[PDB]
PDB file of C-alpha atoms and ligand atoms in Angstrom:
ATOM      1  CA  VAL A   1      18.321 -15.020 -27.378  1.00 57.16           C
ATOM      2  CA  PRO A   2      20.166 -15.204 -24.007  1.00 57.76           C
ATOM      3  CA  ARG A   3      19.159 -17.979 -21.631  1.00 58.54           C
ATOM      4  CA  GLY A   4      18.473 -15.424 -18.893  1.00 55.81           C
ATOM      5  CA  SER A   5      15.912 -13.663 -21.088  1.00 58.58           C
ATOM      6  CA  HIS A   6      14.119 -16.920 -21.974  1.00 57.98           C
ATOM      7  CA  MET A   7      13.678 -17.669 -18.266  1.00 61.55           C
ATOM      8  CA  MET A   8      12.149 -14.247 -17.625  1.00 59.89           C
ATOM      9  CA  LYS A   9       9.750 -14.742 -20.541  1.00 59.61           C
ATOM     10  CA  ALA A  10       8.715 -18.102 -19.083  1.00 53.41           C
ATOM     11  CA  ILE A  11       7.774 -16.353 -15.824  1.00 54.81           C
ATOM     12  CA  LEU A  12       5.839 -13.619 -17.640  1.00 56.81           C
ATOM     13  CA  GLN A  13       4.004 -16.300 -19.629  1.00 55.67           C
ATOM     14  CA  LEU A  14       3.188 -18.118 -16.384  1.00 55.31           C
ATOM     15  CA  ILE A  15       1.574 -14.908 -15.101  1.00 56.70           C
ATOM     16  CA  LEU A  16      -0.637 -14.852 -18.204  1.00 55.65           C
ATOM     17  CA  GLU A  17      -1.708 -18.467 -17.667  1.00 57.20           C
ATOM     18  CA  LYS A  18      -2.699 -17.720 -14.080  1.00 56.51           C
ATOM     19  CA  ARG A  19      -4.551 -14.598 -15.249  1.00 57.68           C
ATOM     20  CA  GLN A  20      -6.520 -16.701 -17.750  1.00 56.71           C
ATOM     21  CA  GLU A  21      -7.481 -19.159 -15.021  1.00 55.27           C
ATOM     22  CA  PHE A  22      -8.202 -16.322 -12.577  1.00 52.73           C
ATOM     23  CA  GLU A  23     -10.706 -14.634 -14.938  1.00 52.80           C
ATOM     24  CA  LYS A  24     -12.888 -17.768 -14.967  1.00 54.31           C
ATOM     25  CA  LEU A  25     -13.799 -17.643 -11.256  1.00 53.36           C
ATOM     26  CA  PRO A  26     -17.599 -17.518 -10.769  1.00 52.65           C
ATOM     27  CA  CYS A  27     -17.409 -14.280  -8.762  1.00 54.52           C
ATOM     28  CA  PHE A  28     -16.509 -12.331 -11.898  1.00 53.30           C
ATOM     29  CA  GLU A  29     -19.439 -13.751 -13.868  1.00 56.98           C
ATOM     30  CA  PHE A  30     -21.751 -12.498 -11.108  1.00 56.77           C
ATOM     31  CA  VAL A  31     -20.120  -9.040 -11.021  1.00 53.48           C
ATOM     32  CA  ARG A  32     -20.392  -8.768 -14.831  1.00 54.01           C
ATOM     33  CA  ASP A  33     -24.005 -10.036 -15.011  1.00 53.72           C
ATOM     34  CA  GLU A  34     -25.855  -7.077 -16.522  1.00 53.57           C
ATOM     35  CA  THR A  35     -29.223  -8.664 -15.711  1.00 54.01           C
ATOM     36  CA  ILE A  36     -28.660  -8.106 -11.963  1.00 57.41           C
ATOM     37  CA  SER A  37     -28.783  -4.485 -10.834  1.00 58.13           C
ATOM     38  CA  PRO A  38     -25.310  -2.951 -10.322  1.00 56.64           C
ATOM     39  CA  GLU A  39     -26.186  -2.015  -6.726  1.00 55.20           C
ATOM     40  CA  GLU A  40     -26.796  -5.687  -5.943  1.00 58.18           C
ATOM     41  CA  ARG A  41     -23.556  -6.808  -7.580  1.00 57.95           C
ATOM     42  CA  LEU A  42     -21.488  -4.283  -5.585  1.00 58.03           C
ATOM     43  CA  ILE A  43     -22.693  -5.646  -2.208  1.00 58.19           C
ATOM     44  CA  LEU A  44     -19.155  -7.034  -1.742  1.00 58.84           C
ATOM     45  CA  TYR A  45     -17.594  -3.554  -1.902  1.00 58.73           C
ATOM     46  CA  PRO A  46     -17.112  -3.094   1.906  1.00 59.36           C
ATOM     47  CA  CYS A  47     -15.076  -6.321   1.982  1.00 56.09           C
ATOM     48  CA  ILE A  48     -12.327  -4.344   0.277  1.00 54.12           C
ATOM     49  CA  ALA A  49     -11.987  -2.296   3.492  1.00 53.11           C
ATOM     50  CA  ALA A  50      -9.965  -5.175   4.945  1.00 51.72           C
ATOM     51  CA  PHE A  51      -7.565  -4.807   1.984  1.00 48.88           C
ATOM     52  CA  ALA A  52      -7.298  -1.289   0.567  1.00 50.62           C
ATOM     53  CA  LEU A  53      -5.607   0.543   3.439  1.00 53.10           C
ATOM     54  CA  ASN A  54      -3.290  -2.395   4.048  1.00 57.46           C
ATOM     55  CA  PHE A  55      -2.357  -2.145   0.368  1.00 57.54           C
ATOM     56  CA  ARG A  56      -1.489   1.510   0.964  1.00 55.42           C
ATOM     57  CA  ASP A  57       0.834   0.437   3.812  1.00 58.46           C
ATOM     58  CA  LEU A  58       2.348  -2.372   1.753  1.00 60.82           C
ATOM     59  CA  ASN A  59       3.405   0.259  -0.817  1.00 60.52           C
ATOM     60  CA  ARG A  60       4.490   2.987   1.612  1.00 55.99           C
ATOM     61  CA  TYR A  61       6.445   0.801   4.016  1.00 54.73           C
ATOM     62  CA  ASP A  62       7.142  -2.695   2.641  1.00 51.73           C
ATOM     63  CA  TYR A  63       7.807  -2.321  -1.100  1.00 49.48           C
ATOM     64  CA  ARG A  64       9.341   1.165  -0.927  1.00 48.57           C
ATOM     65  CA  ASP A  65      12.965   1.805   0.144  1.00 48.48           C
ATOM     66  CA  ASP A  66      13.856   5.496  -0.209  1.00 46.00           C
ATOM     67  CA  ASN A  67      17.408   4.844   1.071  1.00 44.49           C
ATOM     68  CA  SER A  68      18.411   2.737  -1.931  1.00 44.68           C
ATOM     69  CA  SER A  69      20.764   3.324  -4.858  1.00 41.48           C
ATOM     70  CA  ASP A  70      19.711   0.229  -6.784  1.00 41.79           C
ATOM     71  CA  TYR A  71      18.299   0.823 -10.268  1.00 42.33           C
ATOM     72  CA  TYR A  72      15.412  -1.652  -9.928  1.00 44.07           C
ATOM     73  CA  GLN A  73      14.469  -0.582  -6.405  1.00 43.74           C
ATOM     74  CA  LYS A  74      14.203   3.028  -7.609  1.00 39.90           C
ATOM     75  CA  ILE A  75      11.797   1.852 -10.320  1.00 39.22           C
ATOM     76  CA  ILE A  76       9.836   0.045  -7.611  1.00 38.58           C
ATOM     77  CA  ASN A  77       9.755   3.204  -5.459  1.00 38.73           C
ATOM     78  CA  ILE A  78       8.272   5.194  -8.363  1.00 36.87           C
ATOM     79  CA  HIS A  79       5.581   2.524  -8.753  1.00 36.93           C
ATOM     80  CA  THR A  80       4.734   2.645  -5.029  1.00 36.19           C
ATOM     81  CA  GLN A  81       4.120   6.405  -5.179  1.00 32.81           C
ATOM     82  CA  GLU A  82       1.243   5.755  -7.576  1.00 32.01           C
ATOM     83  CA  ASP A  83      -0.332   2.770  -5.807  1.00 31.50           C
ATOM     84  CA  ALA A  84      -0.091   4.417  -2.361  1.00 31.68           C
ATOM     85  CA  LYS A  85      -2.672   6.995  -3.524  1.00 30.76           C
ATOM     86  CA  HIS A  86      -5.496   4.553  -4.270  1.00 33.42           C
ATOM     87  CA  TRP A  87      -6.834   4.080  -0.717  1.00 34.69           C
ATOM     88  CA  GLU A  88      -8.434   7.531  -0.973  1.00 33.79           C
ATOM     89  CA  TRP A  89     -10.211   6.352  -4.126  1.00 35.30           C
ATOM     90  CA  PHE A  90     -11.575   3.369  -2.193  1.00 33.03           C
ATOM     91  CA  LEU A  91     -12.934   5.659   0.536  1.00 37.24           C
ATOM     92  CA  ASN A  92     -14.369   8.053  -2.064  1.00 36.38           C
ATOM     93  CA  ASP A  93     -16.403   5.252  -3.651  1.00 36.57           C
ATOM     94  CA  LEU A  94     -17.315   3.733  -0.270  1.00 35.42           C
ATOM     95  CA  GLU A  95     -19.233   6.908   0.520  1.00 34.95           C
ATOM     96  CA  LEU A  96     -20.745   7.266  -2.973  1.00 33.73           C
ATOM     97  CA  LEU A  97     -22.120   3.703  -2.719  1.00 37.11           C
ATOM     98  CA  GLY A  98     -23.868   4.374   0.603  1.00 34.26           C
ATOM     99  CA  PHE A  99     -21.638   1.949   2.531  1.00 32.83           C
ATOM    100  CA  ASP A 100     -19.975   4.568   4.764  1.00 30.98           C
ATOM    101  CA  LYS A 101     -22.592   3.936   7.419  1.00 30.66           C
ATOM    102  CA  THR A 102     -22.588   5.195  10.989  1.00 33.03           C
ATOM    103  CA  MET A 103     -21.731   2.462  13.483  1.00 35.79           C
ATOM    104  CA  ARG A 104     -19.926   1.707  16.725  1.00 36.34           C
ATOM    105  CA  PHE A 105     -16.122   1.657  16.615  1.00 33.52           C
ATOM    106  CA  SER A 106     -16.206  -2.016  17.684  1.00 36.74           C
ATOM    107  CA  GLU A 107     -18.583  -2.972  14.842  1.00 35.76           C
ATOM    108  CA  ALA A 108     -16.152  -1.529  12.292  1.00 36.77           C
ATOM    109  CA  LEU A 109     -13.321  -3.461  13.983  1.00 34.47           C
ATOM    110  CA  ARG A 110     -15.267  -6.736  14.172  1.00 32.07           C
ATOM    111  CA  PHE A 111     -16.125  -6.322  10.470  1.00 32.61           C
ATOM    112  CA  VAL A 112     -12.540  -5.760   9.290  1.00 33.35           C
ATOM    113  CA  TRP A 113     -11.156  -8.563  11.486  1.00 36.10           C
ATOM    114  CA  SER A 114     -14.112 -10.886  10.750  1.00 38.16           C
ATOM    115  CA  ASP A 115     -13.248 -14.527  10.130  1.00 38.00           C
ATOM    116  CA  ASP A 116     -15.196 -14.166   6.863  1.00 34.96           C
ATOM    117  CA  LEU A 117     -12.553 -11.686   5.608  1.00 37.45           C
ATOM    118  CA  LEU A 118      -9.487 -13.600   6.786  1.00 33.63           C
ATOM    119  CA  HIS A 119      -7.937 -14.084   3.353  1.00 38.83           C
ATOM    120  CA  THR A 120      -8.886 -10.560   2.250  1.00 41.40           C
ATOM    121  CA  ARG A 121      -7.290  -9.041   5.352  1.00 41.21           C
ATOM    122  CA  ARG A 122      -4.116 -11.165   5.213  1.00 38.39           C
ATOM    123  CA  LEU A 123      -3.338 -10.807   1.495  1.00 37.17           C
ATOM    124  CA  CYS A 124      -1.067  -7.760   1.857  1.00 34.89           C
ATOM    125  CA  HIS A 125       0.400  -9.251   5.026  1.00 33.44           C
ATOM    126  CA  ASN A 126       1.366 -12.451   3.177  1.00 33.49           C
ATOM    127  CA  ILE A 127       2.780 -10.412   0.297  1.00 31.85           C
ATOM    128  CA  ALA A 128       4.988  -8.370   2.637  1.00 33.99           C
ATOM    129  CA  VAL A 129       6.226 -11.511   4.429  1.00 37.30           C
ATOM    130  CA  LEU A 130       7.016 -13.108   1.061  1.00 37.98           C
ATOM    131  CA  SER A 131       8.706  -9.937  -0.282  1.00 37.84           C
ATOM    132  CA  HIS A 132      10.741  -8.872   2.770  1.00 37.87           C
ATOM    133  CA  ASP A 133      14.021 -10.652   1.949  1.00 38.89           C
ATOM    134  CA  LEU A 134      13.561 -10.505  -1.858  1.00 36.66           C
ATOM    135  CA  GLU A 135      16.055  -8.798  -4.142  1.00 36.00           C
ATOM    136  CA  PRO A 136      14.443  -6.006  -6.193  1.00 34.58           C
ATOM    137  CA  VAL A 137      14.056  -8.047  -9.392  1.00 34.56           C
ATOM    138  CA  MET A 138      12.023 -10.637  -7.474  1.00 36.50           C
ATOM    139  CA  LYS A 139      10.017  -7.906  -5.759  1.00 37.41           C
ATOM    140  CA  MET A 140       9.061  -6.746  -9.261  1.00 38.85           C
ATOM    141  CA  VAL A 141       7.762 -10.229 -10.065  1.00 41.55           C
ATOM    142  CA  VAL A 142       5.623  -9.968  -6.915  1.00 43.07           C
ATOM    143  CA  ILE A 143       4.287  -6.568  -7.988  1.00 41.37           C
ATOM    144  CA  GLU A 144       3.601  -7.671 -11.570  1.00 44.02           C
ATOM    145  CA  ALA A 145       1.706 -10.777 -10.441  1.00 47.01           C
ATOM    146  CA  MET A 146      -0.251  -8.625  -7.970  1.00 50.46           C
ATOM    147  CA  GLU A 147      -1.036  -5.945 -10.566  1.00 54.52           C
ATOM    148  CA  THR A 148      -2.239  -8.616 -13.010  1.00 55.70           C
ATOM    149  CA  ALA A 149      -4.593 -10.158 -10.453  1.00 53.05           C
ATOM    150  CA  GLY A 150      -5.821  -6.694  -9.470  1.00 54.61           C
ATOM    151  CA  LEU A 151      -6.590  -5.698 -13.062  1.00 55.30           C
ATOM    152  CA  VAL A 152      -8.769  -8.800 -13.439  1.00 57.93           C
ATOM    153  CA  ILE A 153     -10.736  -7.772 -10.372  1.00 60.66           C
ATOM    154  CA  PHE A 154     -11.214  -4.157 -11.334  1.00 59.10           C
ATOM    155  CA  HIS A 155     -12.039  -4.762 -14.978  1.00 60.19           C
ATOM    156  CA  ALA A 156     -14.948  -6.764 -13.551  1.00 62.95           C
ATOM    157  CA  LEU A 157     -15.885  -4.304 -10.778  1.00 66.87           C
ATOM    158  CA  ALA A 158     -15.679  -1.339 -13.164  1.00 67.77           C
ATOM    159  CA  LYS A 159     -18.740  -2.717 -15.020  1.00 65.66           C
ATOM    160  CA  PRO A 160     -21.305  -2.252 -12.196  1.00 64.15           C
ATOM    161  CA  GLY A 161     -19.209   0.690 -11.037  1.00 63.95           C
ATOM    162  CA  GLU A 162     -19.502   2.645 -14.284  1.00 64.61           C
ATOM    163  CA  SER A 163     -23.192   1.694 -14.530  1.00 68.55           C
ATOM    164  CA  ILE A 164     -23.860   3.428 -11.198  1.00 68.59           C
ATOM    165  CA  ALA A 165     -21.630   6.381 -12.082  1.00 68.78           C
ATOM    166  CA  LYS A 166     -23.729   6.907 -15.217  1.00 70.30           C
ATOM    167  CA  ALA A 167     -27.110   6.256 -13.581  1.00 67.26           C
ATOM    168  CA  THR A 168     -26.291   8.694 -10.734  1.00 66.36           C
ATOM    169  CA  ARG A 169     -24.015  11.188 -12.575  1.00 68.33           C
ATOM    170  CA  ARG A 170     -21.379  10.918  -9.857  1.00 66.04           C
ATOM    171  CA  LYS A 171     -17.640  10.528 -10.339  1.00 67.21           C
ATOM    172  CA  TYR A 172     -16.362   7.138  -9.196  1.00 68.69           C
ATOM    173  CA  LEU A 173     -12.623   6.696  -8.712  1.00 67.51           C
ATOM    174  CA  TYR A 174     -12.046   3.100  -7.527  1.00 69.28           C
ATOM    175  CA  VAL A 175     -14.618   0.873  -9.242  1.00 70.78           C
ATOM    176  CA  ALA A 176     -14.100   2.973 -12.349  1.00 69.67           C
ATOM    177  CA  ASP A 177     -12.289   2.862 -15.674  1.00 71.86           C
ATOM    178  CA  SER A 178      -9.959   5.667 -14.532  1.00 72.16           C
ATOM    179  CA  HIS A 179      -8.561   3.245 -11.925  1.00 72.73           C
ATOM    180  CA  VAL A 180      -8.245   0.409 -14.458  1.00 72.80           C
ATOM    181  CA  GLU A 181      -6.524   2.725 -16.968  1.00 73.08           C
ATOM    182  CA  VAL A 182      -3.838   3.963 -14.534  1.00 76.40           C
ATOM    183  CA  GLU A 183       8.850   2.878 -17.570  1.00 73.89           C
ATOM    184  CA  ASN A 184       6.156   0.543 -16.222  1.00 73.81           C
ATOM    185  CA  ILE A 185       7.010  -2.591 -14.243  1.00 73.06           C
ATOM    186  CA  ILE A 186       6.162  -4.894 -17.152  1.00 73.14           C
ATOM    187  CA  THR A 187       8.371  -2.856 -19.498  1.00 72.18           C
ATOM    188  CA  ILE A 188      11.416  -3.238 -17.245  1.00 69.96           C
ATOM    189  CA  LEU A 189      10.770  -6.943 -16.622  1.00 66.41           C
ATOM    190  CA  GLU A 190      10.669  -7.686 -20.364  1.00 64.92           C
ATOM    191  CA  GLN A 191      14.188  -6.212 -20.707  1.00 66.07           C
ATOM    192  CA  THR A 192      15.556  -8.031 -17.635  1.00 66.02           C
ATOM    193  CA  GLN A 193      17.048 -11.512 -17.257  1.00 66.33           C
ATOM    194  CA  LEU A 194      16.727 -14.093 -14.491  1.00 68.62           C
ATOM    195  CA  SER A 195      19.163 -16.656 -13.190  1.00 72.61           C
ATOM    196  CA  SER A 196      18.224 -20.323 -12.897  1.00 73.66           C
ATOM    197  CA  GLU A 197      17.606 -20.005  -9.153  1.00 68.90           C
ATOM    198  CA  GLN A 198      15.511 -16.872  -9.680  1.00 71.22           C
ATOM    199  CA  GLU A 199      13.266 -18.667 -12.187  1.00 67.17           C
ATOM    200  CA  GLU A 200      12.472 -21.368  -9.616  1.00 68.43           C
ATOM    201  CA  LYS A 201      11.773 -18.736  -6.968  1.00 65.60           C
ATOM    202  CA  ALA A 202       9.686 -16.660  -9.378  1.00 64.22           C
ATOM    203  CA  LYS A 203       7.436 -19.661 -10.087  1.00 62.24           C
ATOM    204  CA  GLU A 204       6.813 -20.072  -6.356  1.00 62.13           C
ATOM    205  CA  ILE A 205       6.022 -16.342  -6.125  1.00 60.00           C
ATOM    206  CA  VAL A 206       3.519 -16.314  -9.008  1.00 60.67           C
ATOM    207  CA  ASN A 207       1.828 -19.475  -7.741  1.00 59.31           C
ATOM    208  CA  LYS A 208       1.467 -18.061  -4.217  1.00 59.94           C
ATOM    209  CA  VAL A 209       0.191 -14.638  -5.350  1.00 63.44           C
ATOM    210  CA  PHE A 210      -2.593 -16.105  -7.466  1.00 59.54           C
ATOM    211  CA  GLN A 211      -3.447 -18.654  -4.770  1.00 60.44           C
ATOM    212  CA  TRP A 212      -3.940 -15.878  -2.197  1.00 62.35           C
ATOM    213  CA  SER A 213      -5.964 -13.785  -4.678  1.00 64.43           C
ATOM    214  CA  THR A 214      -8.131 -16.838  -5.416  1.00 66.31           C
ATOM    215  CA  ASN A 215      -8.722 -17.296  -1.675  1.00 67.52           C
ATOM    216  CA  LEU A 216      -9.711 -13.613  -1.465  1.00 67.84           C
ATOM    217  CA  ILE A 217     -12.212 -13.917  -4.320  1.00 67.15           C
ATOM    218  CA  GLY A 218     -13.591 -17.051  -2.667  1.00 65.06           C
ATOM    219  CA  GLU A 219     -14.380 -14.939   0.395  1.00 62.45           C
ATOM    220  CA  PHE A 220     -16.055 -12.356  -1.834  1.00 70.87           C
ATOM    221  CA  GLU A 221     -18.241 -15.108  -3.331  1.00 73.15           C
ATOM    222  CA  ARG A 222     -19.277 -16.485   0.063  1.00 71.72           C
ATOM    223  CA  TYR A 223     -20.007 -12.913   1.172  1.00 71.83           C
ATOM    224  CA  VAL A 224     -22.335 -12.297  -1.802  1.00 72.87           C
ATOM    225  CA  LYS A 225     -24.197 -15.558  -1.122  1.00 70.80           C
ATOM    226  CA  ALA A 226     -24.652 -14.530   2.516  1.00 72.66           C
ATOM    227  CA  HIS A 227     -25.975 -11.054   1.617  1.00 72.06           C
ATOM    228  CA  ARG A 228     -28.250 -11.695  -1.369  1.00 70.24           C
ATOM    229  CA  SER A 229     -31.024  -9.564   0.140  1.00 70.96           C
ATOM    230  CA  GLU A 230     -28.757  -6.498   0.477  1.00 72.54           C
ATOM    231  CA  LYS A 231     -27.433  -3.936  -1.974  1.00 71.73           C
ATOM    232  CA  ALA A 232     -25.543  -0.682  -2.281  1.00 72.73           C
ATOM    233  CA  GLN A 233     -27.573   2.457  -1.534  1.00 73.58           C
ATOM    234  CA  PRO A 234     -26.138   5.243  -3.704  1.00 72.30           C
ATOM    235  CA  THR A 235     -29.157   7.474  -3.019  1.00 71.32           C
ATOM    236  CA  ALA A 236     -28.329   7.620   0.707  1.00 72.27           C
ATOM    237  CA  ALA A 237     -25.177   9.599  -0.177  1.00 74.02           C
ATOM    238  CA  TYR A 238     -26.759  12.291  -2.381  1.00 72.89           C
TER     239      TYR A 238
HETATM  240  N1  67I B   1      -5.447  -1.638  -7.778  1.00 76.30           N
HETATM  241  C1  67I B   1      -5.796  -2.051  -6.432  1.00 76.30           C
HETATM  242  C2  67I B   1      -4.637  -2.936  -6.028  1.00 76.30           C
HETATM  243  C3  67I B   1      -4.753  -4.460  -6.063  1.00 76.30           C
HETATM  244  C4  67I B   1      -3.779  -5.312  -6.571  1.00 76.30           C
HETATM  245  N2  67I B   1      -4.099  -6.579  -6.438  1.00 76.30           N
HETATM  246  C5  67I B   1      -5.295  -6.659  -5.842  1.00 76.30           C
HETATM  247  C6  67I B   1      -6.058  -7.788  -5.492  1.00 76.30           C
HETATM  248 BR1  67I B   1      -5.365  -9.573  -5.854  1.00 76.30          BR
HETATM  249  C7  67I B   1      -7.290  -7.611  -4.869  1.00 76.30           C
HETATM  250  C8  67I B   1      -7.755  -6.325  -4.607  1.00 76.30           C
HETATM  251 BR2  67I B   1      -9.481  -6.145  -3.720  1.00 76.30          BR
HETATM  252  C9  67I B   1      -6.990  -5.212  -4.978  1.00 76.30           C
HETATM  253  C10 67I B   1      -5.736  -5.376  -5.594  1.00 76.30           C
HETATM  254  C11 67I B   1      -5.627  -0.784  -5.600  1.00 76.30           C
HETATM  255  O1  67I B   1      -4.970   0.148  -6.126  1.00 76.30           O
HETATM  256  O2  67I B   1      -6.111  -0.649  -4.441  1.00 76.30           O
END
């Protein structure tokens, strides 16, 4: 009924429209293609190395503010305690997939900072820069947009992930349903109102978040096309 609640609902509906467009990217059709072996489809998994530990830091140090009495910021802090745990899931599955290979320190560094992973590596950086001077209600819009994009990615990746978990009888934690199925942010947002200026800013936020996620998926697609002869090697980690 109140005008402030209609504006919030418009932003939450905008997130759904971006999600619908985001799900149609060709990278997700490849990852979901059951006719290609799941090891081949997960060749892009090491690309996430340029993201996952930065996402841990985004939650520990950029989103979180332990010295805050604000009601919304304390909800955000609770959310960050969950998401800051997931980098260990990424490293768990990196080893299970046979991608935790021995190499020179400089090869690991040149991989993470590769120009082919520029958008992947800078996603959390751009989010932190965008979020720094945001009031907590706008930070929540950032987090909700980010969580929606992320669920699209891991619903897709959980398909070849759970196929390998079943075919090898090993417990996957990151490309796995348990990660997908993890007072939520969306529940608080639906009860909260936005001012007129906040609705304009929230549109800019949602547009930027899904643009940077789309750039990241674009890099994943180019990476697959450059590594068609390679695949995960789960047997190397037995
Ligand atoms: N659930 C993921 C977080 C996440 C959220 N958004 C993401 C995007 Br957009 C791309 C990638 Br790769 C990962 C994410 C995690 O916990 O590490």
